[PDB]
Design a protein around this ligand. Structure first.
Ligand SMILES: [Mg+2]
Ligand SMILES: [Mg+2]
Ligand SMILES: [Mg+2]
Ligand SMILES: [Mg+2]
Lengths: 401, 401, 401, 401
């Protein structure tokens, strides 16, 4: 019945509207059909080096589905995987392109069938979703800032708890002594080997101050952003084990799965990873080797809602539970909410400190925010979001038709 | 001393100048310095879905090295790997971006030191490079089109041998009975399970015709483009073993390394793969599991000349030899020539049936072609290639500065 | 262009000039060409039983390259590995001979192209190199003698920290209660089974006093010289874990790689080894079994600069960082400096307590010493050293031509 | 009561007395005592690059045992292993030094106790020793030269059979079409990857001609000299399986033990190796991985008679039988004979094609040769050999005292 007619790509250079958001660049899409139904998706490359590559991949993929039936979601996914060459040897950019399209197709399918996406994923398994305040090294607040001292870290923790959260995530090593950012700047390159006394102390003092301010019951997730190597990851874990750490996220990159297993066998802190792992194939070795307690696929990278569901289902057989990685526009948030509502192995939801920024919220028509440390799913047909056209018109980059 | 001043990106939509090359789109770069020395690179996404993403990644990566010293090649490489977020969770597009820049930096360094790149890679190890005629399902020489019948395959084989080659590569399953292309069209989807009788016979009859036309001594490489799955790959290998097959290329994709090992253990034909494997980390499980005889990294995808050399050095300890994957512009060709000249574990060089096309050759100022089945290295400083400005001006897409 | 014309071998029997240096016997070489460019190298057998074998292996290897083009460094390396019989079943002596030659060729190539060796290895990755004060069981500074009591070890530690180091290495079990040396004398043979109470107390008391003298921040590397066996290596590690040990070096010999793995799994102190491990092939089992945090190839043993770099590149994929082993003449020091400057996985640099000895220094024309705990690379073309002909004339043992 | 007084080292440059033996250079020692008893030994580096290194290692090791009691053979061995630094990371040269001294000490102990060495090794287990004619690529008997054509190979085979041998060994790939020698010349470098058709035919034609000339009952050992890599080793084995091959020797080098296992699992021809494998530690991974049917330690390399016996005893538990590697002077021959007479897991004895050369035989006072394809042990006290001082005075290089 329906056919895809066009795909709009939005290159959301947020610096155009808010200079505090200088680096951040969500990439959003809208898939239109000849029935009048449209669906929105997101390419999960809003931070780091990749936004322009993300726009480009939609230009490479979208032409293949113009004129095609949007309802054959498995077929479309499999075509991208099998018949594009790169589908069988992809990566963050290629799978992100597949993801954005997949999400927009689920949106269309939900609207067509008149139900929220979680209904098509298996129904309302989880009525409310425990949520954590994410990345407190950038503070907890409306704007806030790069935090350096343990007291500043403790204050962000107190602010998260006052806001109703009973779980927080922090990278205690990302920010160096001078307030520089080791994720994106050439600082503390020795992190990949072994930590120096001062660095160990810097990270531990921040965690220690946060635990003290939070009390014992609230949970702390320690994020590492793959800054450490196998040996420093273990060295640091042993320093922070005394603080009862809930999860250890991305203690090393996922490119060597045997090293990930080694880290997991070497600390009592359960390991989380997944934002930089894509497709069921990207999880096979992590799961088989029993290296992770929590999988963190980004639905805007891992292959979308179709593949994301499959990742969750697979993780379940290894007792691996799921926290969707969410750090982008409002589309990533609703995709995650529908997924986490339906899956039986949901553990916790990530609410990023930037998700409250006006320049991010204004990209879409609805605001979905946690209340008292919990999220609920949207209830309208499809994803329950639309692009805010008054804003996104400034960001329109390409229309594929 | 020197600083990078700008990076030009060329989106080589060949269809603008030659309609017959419609779905081929090399992506080239030029890195310019304040000394007047320039270097050229290539993003290895000339086919499949990815050219526009490849243009985009250069826009994402290039701004990070404007103003920087081009001579610190290991440092620039490591910074892209470590400090961009996605470098540690990359893929074909991200590592292609890194590759192009790296190749351009080697070009600069060679010109700066007054010697060809092979000298910087360890000197002249191989004086001449045995070369094969690549992808004969698309014909050789005069008759350039999709081949279907066994006699058409035998004719292409004779033509390659007439052209002085003593080795060919063919995918005998890519083209179906009707002349449709299974790599890029939804045809023969059952390929990934088990082959039907007609398909097995189709493939084997083409190989039979070619062996018969070539005599027993010339080598046949069977390319599969990852079209088969574990079970059908083993199935077909058994049907073609009798023809004395030199290598079996990409019998399945590389996303499940345990399946690759199983294929390797189930056929006597040695396995080759690597065009969809990136960086040392992408080879670790293939080599450790002793799954491949020959590695085929593409220097325009795998992380460039710096990482390519490292992959070759690594392969060597497993008795794995190297044929660089070459299927793009003239930049990929010279990058490969220098690599293969320097490495001790070189096996054979790939000469693609398209590398003789006018619209590819005109991209660069020099023509380097094999003679009597052998290649030799360029001898000028750097890569020994320049872009043909008269042509590439039509393709200039972005200038980063 | 050029041909190798002659190779000089210097049997540097230091006792001929300095009776205090009696055991020590650096072996140096100079490779001369018909262009007037010469390069120097070193065979890394200055201590233990091996110096005269080291002179001999150059007599065996050098004739093979007289008249050959020195720039083909990979080709020369591969020839020695492949076509001498013993290259494929070598060991400390054979690979040491290859090493010396390889280092001299890098010197030549740097000179010819007019740049320091680090530029040919990939550029200036590390602008300065953190350095440790090495082998404090023989004192530091004013006191140049065999240390016995915990208080003496504490005094050495203070001296090093006063000299501006923030890291030290000590072997706390090498010297017995009577001041005898278990590395070279038949004492404490029970070390390779299980330690006796007094021995355990002896070692731990020395570490305890050093940690107390140093404060908590400075790093301690514990050197074992392969004196312990698997079971005593673990037993001692558990006794010294409480002092926060940075690395545990050569806890056992590397001849049984499974035992090395077992030691690494049985202590939380990260393992370093590599001075008695040669070529890529000598690290394969160490790396694959994930047994080492730090690789310590000696560039004058492991196969030279060409093979050393490949070892560092390989190490990196297992998050193994590099401290080159340096305990010889000034040639070893500069080869290490160039290597450590270029590699992204450098961790720390070894400065031996004997490196300031007049009889070692006078072998060469320049001095390169650390300052405030840091080394920088030479900046001259090639290695940045020449032989001091007024001294080495008396060590000249052979001229191969 | 006895003490070692001196150690003479003989650098047997046979070219001084015989130009046809041009490069071949046995290295012999004699260990003298204050009791007037002396023992002789050999450093196993007579061919390839290493004889001068072999002379040097005796100069390094011998001083350590002057004044010591020769009878403590395990103690001396263990001291060289443990207290020399390099003993715990040695290789062919270092362990050859140990070996020569060890063999000399067994000679002494046998003379002291009035019995042949085989008595001290466990008595007369094997009364006669099946012997094969070794290295027929260099002809046999009347026609001693480099063989190229299959007819030449068949003729050497007949000659050996007419000489009373029922087993032969040949390397069918060492000599190229032009009579060049791939073991010591840069020829057929592609051997380490995959064989070309011509090379496969060349090798198989030579084996085919020998089998046809020999009949079906006589055994053929195929020697490869580690010239092949894992992939070509398997490729070649498949082509010659039809000729009923007794053993496949050194199909690849022993530096990657996982590759050796792979080769062993991929051909039905039983594998032999060991001449480039030293000490018990050098056989551990070969044995544990069940990669070898026959172990071939050289007693003049592997650690001598003490360690050789331990290697034989270890091999036994894996059903691995022993052929001692013998290609040196007459001392190597008698050490082998004694060992093989005593061990229960002897399989076959190697009789080298140059064993009857005048310049080889004249080094020693006795001549032990096979008859009708069988060797027997010497029956004199000790090894049953003395040096021929009239000849070896011309070769004396050093006397350590
Ligand atoms: Mg994260
Ligand atoms: Mg291919
Ligand atoms: Mg050491
Ligand atoms: Mg042999």
């Amino acid at each position: 019945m329906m056919k895809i007619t066009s795909i709009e790509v939005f290159d959301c250079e947020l610096k155009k509207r808010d200079q505090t958001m200088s680096s951040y660049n969500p990439v959003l899409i809208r898939v239109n059909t000849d029935s009048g139904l449209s669906g929105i998706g997101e390419v999960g490359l809003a931070y780091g080096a990749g936004a322009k590559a993300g726009v480009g991949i939609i230009r490479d993929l979208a032409p293949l589905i113009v004129g095609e039936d949007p309802l054959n979601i498995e077929k479309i996914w499999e075509f991208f995987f099998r018949k594009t060459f790169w589908g069988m040897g992809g990566g963050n950019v290629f799978y992100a392109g597949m993801s954005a399209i997949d999400i927009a197709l689920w949106d269309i399918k939900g609207k067509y069938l008149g139900v929220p996406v979680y209904q098509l994923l298996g129904g309302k398994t989880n009525e409310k979703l425990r949520t954590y305040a994410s990345q407190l090294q950038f503070g907890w607040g409306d704007k806030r800032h790069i935090l350096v001292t343990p007291e500043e870290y403790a204050e962000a923790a107190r602010a998260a708890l006052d806001d109703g959260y009973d779980a927080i995530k922090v990278d205690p090593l990302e920010i160096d002594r001078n307030g520089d950012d080791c994720v994106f700047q050439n600082r503390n390159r020795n992190y990949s080997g072994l930590l120096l006394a001062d660095q160990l102390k810097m990270g531990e003092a921040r965690i220690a101050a946060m635990r003290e301010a939070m009390g014992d019951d609230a949970d702390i997730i320690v994020e590492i952003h793959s800054l450490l190597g196998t040996n420093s990851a273990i060295q640091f874990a042993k320093a922070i084990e005394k603080y009862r750490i809930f999860l250890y996220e991305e203690p090393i990159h996922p490119l060597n799965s045997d090293n990930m297993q080694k880290v997991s066998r070497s600390t009592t802190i359960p390991i989380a990873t997944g934002e930089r792992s894509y497709t069921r194939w990207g999880y096979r070795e992590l799961l088989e080797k029993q290296s992770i307690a929590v999988a963190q696929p980004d639905l805007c990278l891992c292959g979308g809602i179709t593949e994301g569901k499959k990742i969750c289902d697979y993780a379940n057989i290894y007792d691996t539970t799921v926290q969707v990685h969410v750090c982008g526009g409002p589309v990533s948030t609703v995709a995650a909410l529908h997924m986490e509502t339906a899956i039986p192995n949901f553990i916790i939801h990530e609410h990023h400190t930037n998700a409250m920024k006006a320049s991010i919220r204004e990209l879409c028509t609805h605001d979905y925010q946690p209340e008292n440390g919990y999220y609920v799913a949207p209830e309208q047909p499809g994803l329950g979001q639309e692009l805010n056209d008054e804003v996104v018109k400034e960001y329109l980059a390409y229309v594929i038709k």
